[PDB]
Structure formats: structure tokens, C-alpha cells
Design a protein around this ligand. Structure first.
Ligand SMILES: C=C(C)[C@H]1CN[C@H](C(=O)O)[C@H]1CC(=O)O
Ligand SMILES: C=C(C)[C@H]1CN[C@H](C(=O)O)[C@H]1CC(=O)O
Ligand SMILES: C=C(C)[C@H]1CN[C@H](C(=O)O)[C@H]1CC(=O)O
Ligand SMILES: C=C(C)[C@H]1CN[C@H](C(=O)O)[C@H]1CC(=O)O
Ligand SMILES: [Cl-]
Ligand SMILES: [Cl-]
Ligand SMILES: [Cl-]
Ligand SMILES: [Cl-]
Ligand SMILES: [Zn+2]
Ligand SMILES: [Zn+2]
Ligand SMILES: [Zn+2]
Ligand SMILES: [Zn+2]
Ligand SMILES: [Zn+2]
Ligand SMILES: [Zn+2]
Ligand SMILES: [Zn+2]
Ligand SMILES: [Zn+2]
Ligand SMILES: [Zn+2]
Ligand SMILES: [Zn+2]
Ligand SMILES: [Zn+2]
Ligand SMILES: [Zn+2]
Ligand SMILES: [Zn+2]
Ligand SMILES: [Zn+2]
Ligand SMILES: [Zn+2]
Ligand SMILES: [Zn+2]
Lengths: 254, 254, 254, 254
């Protein structure tokens, strides 16, 4: 039947333009962990597909009227059949779209320069010299905004007061940490990737929550269950382990 | 948006009437491995259900017209939503209904009294003194009726021949094995259950084939993949092997 | 073109010294689930073998230098061809040796005396009165040492803390659970075996994770896939669940 | 690494040139059951490949000096890494090349015009009016040539005396049966395919032996074991059933 439309977004090492001299077109343009995962899903389920980068370049957040943007909006409006990305499974997004079981588990943590006394979210929260923030309107910022834990309520109050503390995307955030006394609240699997390529950066503390990435589908999708079975199959075969090693392997870095 | 109809059949230790002083009603009438399984599936998937025994007491097979009976036919006619029983997954039945992934492995084997020279299906096929057969309109009968293997064609010709060789149910086949010079072709997990309680009976040879029991649904039902997902969860929690041990142990023979 | 060296460890009911009046020698010294498995594997694949106990009595873990010990290290150094034991398949060990497909499922769970309010790992982590730990340099210890989950990090901090909390082996952990206010984090199939023989002990909560035992080989060994093929055959013949039932049944507690 | 060379041979519905107006080239030229199977193997094992039709257009037989031809010879000479075809697993070929476990099971049977008194190999063998034969130097002719069964010794004597009784390929054989009083000894899975498209042809009798098709590799191939595991995986997932239904579905024919 018709090829499924896959909405996605550039984010290293999940989805990237592969290197080439000639101008690549169509699906051939892309590589990365999520691309490999998509190829597995397409084979297991037996579908053809066309990858389309989400127009507004966003994952999905609600405005002050409840309207969604990004990949989440693309699924809601049935402009795409699947979202294949590091799309964080959150309760609020589950109200609007369906997710497969997670293909990767992670948690919010801290990216910061190496060799520092800072050791935790508590240390950052109880001072003002070192600035810190998160990707604006991302799943992380949302976690802080909703938190009722004391340390995280204070940190959120800190990000709310300075609009400049938040960053537009991971790239801006990582460079902030490299060019200023700045700590980025960031999903741990990206921190893992970054710290293995930048030896002067490190993760501070542990994971302050636990969450996963899943394949997004519109609510009532005829593919969501089959996708979950496929991911379970891949995990049982150690394929998601192999796939992550393939794409996270970098440098390295003590 | 309604309770599911579950069709099933009495068959020890999968489904039985609970022993009680007072009259029991509804789903509470039943206990057994399949009843415990059904409760786990209903918890995971969040559905209410109503259990019914299939009227004609058959699992299912086709006539010359190609028309089905029994549990399979109840699913075909959309008279039940799930068949939860020792319903053998066969390639023949797959053309008519859908099955979840298997929840239990079994294979055809032989039930016969101990203390004889008989050691395999080939030994039975060689001769005519010892009679043999299977349950009528069950998967084992169909295996023999459809087999292209020479030994099994020969055995089918014999069962087919003798009028009483195909028994009504396991109770009758077991009794015939006990009272006459008769071997019953029977699924291995029932043999396991019986030979642990009746020390004068034994399994002859190994498995003649290898397959499984699955939850049946009408073809195309969206529940088939949900049930598979629930079975996968139960396997990860290792609840299935524990559930089998609960209903199969321990009695024993010297 | 030579007999295989099989490394293993005494561990009931997987591998034990047979009870006999006269002195037994060589492979004939041993019995148990893993010994029965090994005989099936050797029949299918047609190899002769020689069983040896690993000298340092350990399954395997890495030090700060990243160097391995125990059964894993015996495979790493090509001192044995197969490790046939309750050797837990872990993603950490997969970097150093190869495993067949699993022959048995297990997960980490909790062994503790009956008649308490404790109901989960979270209950143990909340407090300090009841002590807890695991077998030293085993998969369960490494799970906790490497965990990024908050509850399990907290538990690791506690085990790590107390000096005697990490026990030498299962015999010692079981005895500590029997004699002190202590809970042992232990693999579920050993808990199953123990709580069926010691009616004053019980499993607390469910599985904390889910994995399996596999046959280990040196990395790159061509036997790894042959062993997997033999395990697949045994599963088709349904010999594995029967073999487990043989070595796990039946005793019982009121 | 290097792409594997796959040797194969045109034979409907296993391997065929797919219909096209433009001249197709490379792997794109081909379709059929064996092509689908190859695609599965390439994905599961993770290899790239190039399909090459065996130059001499033969499967593999030995001359009167022991030298092989066909796909078997291609593997023996390491001119191909895999043979993917309806290549019959026979003991004599196992001496020269390695096979995976079978992906399809079949047996020698009889193709003949419909509505005839003929019912068996015995009926043909005990007369001379109706001629019969097999593909020259195929696995079937070989079976008859080696047979020590009486009925098949007589039939072989019959094919040995008339060199004209044997046919060059299946096409010549099927047309013989349609244009002359001629019965073809033929592998049953091809008979199945043919009789569902030619309503005036039918299979006479049952299967007179039992055998399988397997993926051929050179002896000592580093892929044979992985290929066997892949086929076992496919079977457990009902994929070989689905694949056969896909390609054998024709007409139909009462
Ligand atoms: C901006 C990125 C890359 C995404 C990725 N997952 C989160 C999401 O799905 O919202 C975002 C990151 C974050 O909020 O820390
Ligand atoms: C008659 C019973 C108990 C059932 C069980 N499974 C098979 C079925 O689903 O047809 C039947 C047994 C058999 O045919 O040996
Ligand atoms: C110490 C034993 C008995 C072994 C068994 N499997 C685990 C292993 O392979 O490391 C160990 C147990 C554990 O760590 O809970
Ligand atoms: C001539 C064909 C098509 C092949 C197919 N398998 C057998 C082989 O591998 O030799 C041959 C047929 C036969 O002998 O009946
Ligand atoms: Cl695009
Ligand atoms: Cl009823
Ligand atoms: Cl020793
Ligand atoms: Cl070619
Ligand atoms: Zn794959
Ligand atoms: Zn729509
Ligand atoms: Zn929902
Ligand atoms: Zn699993
Ligand atoms: Zn629950
Ligand atoms: Zn319906
Ligand atoms: Zn099937
Ligand atoms: Zn058990
Ligand atoms: Zn054997
Ligand atoms: Zn070696
Ligand atoms: Zn792994
Ligand atoms: Zn059992
Ligand atoms: Zn596939
Ligand atoms: Zn060579
Ligand atoms: Zn060989
Ligand atoms: Zn199977």
C-alpha cells in the first residue's frame, strides 16, 4: 500500500545528513541511530516509507491555548504516520499521540565543564554564579516546570526569571557550556555522546528522573502495536544494544 | 467499548469447574492454568470479560465443504472475541483465524501403558494388533489426515479405518488406553500431566512435531497483537513457567 | 580436532558432586541441570569434553584496571572452550565474551524471611535497619554498581557501605538471611529453588530486571552459534522445560 | 566487507526475471520465493550481495570421474559464497558442500494428466504404454538410480534403457505430460505450483521420499551456521509459510 510518511528532525547521532559530494535526495540523504531503527521497523513490519524533516524543526510543545507544534503536531494532524526521533515519552504528550514501548531509556542530567567542585543539582541550585538552563520548551524544561521537589522548584524559578538561561537547541546549549560558566540540563544519552567526544566536558551527578524515547504515532494508529512488538523483538536480539554502540562510539575520552 | 466474550472448553488442568460447597456463578465457576492466564491478560490490557463454553464441545476442524466447527468456528463467526484454551496453533487454522504468539509449547506424542516393546510411531505403524487413534476434530487428527509423510499416512489410513479409533475427547482416549490394547496420539503437555498421575501409563518416543498453544481471535482483530504484547510481558516477568509449574506439579511416580 | 575444555562452578541444582559410595573421577563426578544440558549439547554437536572447576571460584567481574576474573576470565584467556553454568548474560559481559542464546530466564529479585511488611526493593532502600547485599563479583552486584536508577544507586551505596553486606557465595548469603536481619538480592530461579525447600523464606516483590543464562565462549568462537543451534533444537524438542522441572521439583511448603 | 556472491538459477516460482519495459540490471532483475528468502537472510545476517546466474545453468551432478558441475561446482571452486535455489539436500552433495537446515520440505512424486486410473508408482512401473522419466542428472533421477526398493529399481531400469525418457529441465517435462502420454517424476512443491495453474494436470500418488531444500555454502563457510539460525528464526515467525503462500498462490484450480 501507500508508503508511510515518517516525520523526523536532525539531531546527532540519531539523525544526520550523511557525507557526500553529490547532492543526495530522498531517504538516501540520512543516517544515524534512528535511521537504522527505522530500517529495522520497515523490514520487520514490511512497509515502505518517505522521510520528511518536520517543517518547524520542533519536537512538540503546547502553547497557551493547548495547540501543539513540531512532530507531535504533525502526527496529531495526520500529516505523518510515524515520528522516528529522540522523542521523549511524557505523560502530556501521551494525551495527544500514542507511543510505542521505549527503544531507549535515559534521564535528565547535567552537562558541565570538567574538574569542578560541582557534584549535583543541589550544588547548582544553592548558588547564582554559575548559570544553568535547558532547551526551551523541551521535555526537560517541562520536567522542571512541573516539579514539586524543592531543589527543582528553585532551579525552575531560576530559569523562569532569566529568559536568557534557556537555549534554543542542544547545539546552543553545548557551546554555552564550552564558552561560559554555564551548566546544561540535558538528556543523559546525549550527554553520553558528547562527553566521549569532548574531553573537557563531563556529566555532573546522576539521573534525576527516568524516562524513554518511543516511536510516535497518531492516536488510534494501526501500526503502534506492531511497532511495539518489533522493538521488543529487537531488544530480545540485543540489536538496540548493538545499534547504540555503533553510533555512540567516539574518540575516545577518559 | 464492551466486555469481551471469551470462548473456551473444560480441559484439565487448563480450565475446570472449581470445587465449592455453594453454587458458583459466572466467571467464578472456573479455575485452571488458562483462567490464571486470562486474569493476567485482562489486568495487563485492562478489559472486562465473560467466559462461555463452546456449545458443540469441539476445538475445530473443517468438513468436506470446508466449513469449520467448534472454538475456531465461534471466532470465525465473530461470536467470541478471544478463545482462551489449549488451542493448538496450526498452519491450517491460521488461514481462518488469528493466533497470538504461543504461550505454551507442545508436540504430538504417544500415550501408552508401560512395559511394552513399543518405542515409536514407526513401531505402531508396522503392525495391526495394537490399535491407535486421536481425538476427533482436533489438531492431532488433522495432522495425520493432512500428513504427506509415509509413516503418518499409513497411521491415518488405520485410524480412518477402525470406527472407534477416533475418540470423543481425552477422557475417552485415556480410558481406552487404560482398558484396551490402544495407544493414543496426544499432545505432549497433556501426556506430561497424565503420566505424572497414572504411573501405569507412559509417553512413547519423543515429539512427532513441535508447535504451541495460542490465544485465538477472529481474523484481523486488533486484540491479537495486544494479547501478544501481554504474553511477551508475562514471559519477561517469567510468570508463565511459574504458572505452568503451579498447575502441573507434583504428584509423582516411583 | 580435540576435546573441549568446559569450565563451570559448583552451584545447586545446576552443578553438584554426585553422591556415591566409591570414589568417582573425571566428568563422572558431576550431576545437575547444567550437566544434563551439557550431555545434550555434546550429543547434538558430537564433541567430547573435559569438565573443570574454575580455580578462583568466581563467575566474573572487572577491577578498576578493567581486568576480569572467574569464569569470564577463563574464556577471555582461551583457557576453556565453553562455560557451562548459571552464567548470567549481561551487556557488560557481552563486550568481553560471547554467549549462546539463553537456555533459562531469570531476573534479580529478593530473598527474605516471611512474615514481614517488606514488599519491594523500594521498601529496603527507604531504611537502614534491615541490611541487604549480593554475591561479590557476580552479575547482581554489577547490576547495582552500574545502575543509574535512583533507588538502585541508593541500594548500591548501602551495600558498598557495610563491609559484610556483600557475601562470598549463595551459601553464605542464604545463611545470613537465615541468621540476621538481612535480605539477599538473588537471581529468581535460585530463589525459586530455595523457597521451595525452606518454608521460612520467601521472594519479596517481582523481578527487578529480566535476562537469562547462556553458554559462554571466547569472543569470536565458532562454537557460540553451534551451541545456539543445539539449544534451539532442545527447545523444539521441549527438553529444556522438562529438564528444569526434573531438577527444580517438588518438595513444597504448606 | 565485500559483498557475497550468490549463485542461483531461473526456476518458477523460486527465481524469475520480473516484468519490465526497461532493461533491468543487477539484483533488481530478479523476483521470486528464493529472492524474498535471500532478502531476509541479507537483512538478518547483515550482508550485501550480488546475484549471478550459474554459467552452465545446472544445479550440480558428478561426471564419471567425480567432478561436479552447476551451482555445486561454483561453491566447491569458491566462485560463489551462497547458492540460493531449490537445491535439494542430498547425502552425496553434503560430501562436497555444506547446507543450512532446510527452508522447505518436499518429496519425489508424480505429475500426470487428470482423470486417469493411474494412482501410484506401482501402476506405472508394471506397464509400458505410458512413458515416464525425470530431469536428467537431477536429485530425483539420482534417487531412482540408487534405490534398492523393487518398484523403483524397475522404474530406473526403464529410464536407463530409453535415453529419451529423461528430460533436460522441468519445462520440457511439464510439456511432455501435456503433449504426450507421459508421467514426470518431479519434486512435490513444483507439482503443487503446477497443478494450481494447469487444471488438466494432477499429482499421482503421494510422496515416495522425504527431503528438503537448503542454502548451499562451500565446506567450512563462515556463514552456514548463521544462515541456519536465520532460517530457524523465519520458521518460528511463520515467515516461510507466508512466503510460500505468496508465491504458490495461483489461478486457482479444483
Ligand atoms: C531538543 C531535543 C533534542 C529533544 C530531545 N528529547 C527532548 C524532547 O523530546 O522534548 C528534547 C531535549 C530536552 O528537552 O532535553
Ligand atoms: C481435544 C483437546 C484437548 C485439544 C487440545 N489442543 C488440540 C486442539 O486444539 O485441537 C486438541 C487435542 C489434540 O488434537 O490432540
Ligand atoms: C554466584 C552465582 C551463583 C552466579 C549465578 N549467576 C550470577 C553470575 O553469573 O554472575 C551469579 C549470581 C548473582 O550475581 O546474583
Ligand atoms: C531441475 C531442478 C529444477 C532441480 C530442483 N531440485 C532438484 C535438484 O536440486 O537436483 C532438481 C529437480 C529434480 O531432480 O526433480
Ligand atoms: Cl525533508
Ligand atoms: Cl457457559
Ligand atoms: Cl576440576
Ligand atoms: Cl547473472
Ligand atoms: Zn534486523
Ligand atoms: Zn486524519
Ligand atoms: Zn493513551
Ligand atoms: Zn527478554
Ligand atoms: Zn500488575
Ligand atoms: Zn467482529
Ligand atoms: Zn503458518
Ligand atoms: Zn521453575
Ligand atoms: Zn538424539
Ligand atoms: Zn582460543
Ligand atoms: Zn547486549
Ligand atoms: Zn511441564
Ligand atoms: Zn523478515
Ligand atoms: Zn578458496
Ligand atoms: Zn558435512
Ligand atoms: Zn518452534
Amino acid at each position: 500500500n501507500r508508503s508511510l510518511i515518517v516525520t523526523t528532525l536532525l539531531e546527532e547521532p540519531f539523525v544526520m545528513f550523511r557525507k557526500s559530494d553529490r547532492t543526495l535526495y530522498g531517504n538516501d540523504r540520512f543516517e544515524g541511530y534512528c535511521i537504522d531503527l527505522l530500517k529495522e521497523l520497515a523490514h520487520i513490519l514490511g512497509f515502505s516509507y518517505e522521510i520528511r524533516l518536520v517543517e518547524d524543526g520542533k519536537y512538540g510543545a503546547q502553547d497557551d491555548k493547548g495547540q501543539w507544534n513540531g512532530m507531535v503536531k504533525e502526527l496529531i494532524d495526520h500529516k505523518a504516520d510515524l515520528a522516528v526521533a529522540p522523542l521523549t515519552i511524557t505523560h502530556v504528550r501521551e494525551k495527544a499521540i500514542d507511543f510505542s514501548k521505549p527503544f531507549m531509556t535515559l534521564g535528565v542530567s547535567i552537562l558541565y565543564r570538567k574538574g569542578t567542585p560541582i557534584d549535583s543539582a543541589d550544588d547548582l541550585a544553592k548558588q547564582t554564579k554559575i548559570e544553568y538552563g535547558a532547551v526551551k520548551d523541551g521535555a526537560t524544561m517541562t520536567f522542571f516546570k512541573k516539579s514539586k521537589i524543592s531543589t527543582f522548584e528553585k532551579m525552575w524559578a531560576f530559569m523562569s526569571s532569566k529568559p536568557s538561561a534557556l537555549v534554543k537547541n542542544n547545539e546552543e546549549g553545548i557551546q554555552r557550556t564550552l564558552t561560559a560558566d554555564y551548566a546544561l540540563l540535558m538528556e543523559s544519552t546525549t550527554i553520553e555522546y558528547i562527553t566521549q567526544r569532548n574531553c573537557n566536558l563531563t556529566q555532573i551527578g546522576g539521573l534525576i528522573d527516568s524516562k524513554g524515547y518511543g516511536i510516535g504515532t497518531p492516536m488510534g494508529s494501526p501500526y503502534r502495536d506492531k511497532i511495539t512488538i518489533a522493538i521488543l523483538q529487537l531488544q530480545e536480539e540485543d540489536k538496540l544494544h548493538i545499534m547504540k554502540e555503533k553510533w555512540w562510539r567516539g574518540s575516545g575520552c577518559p
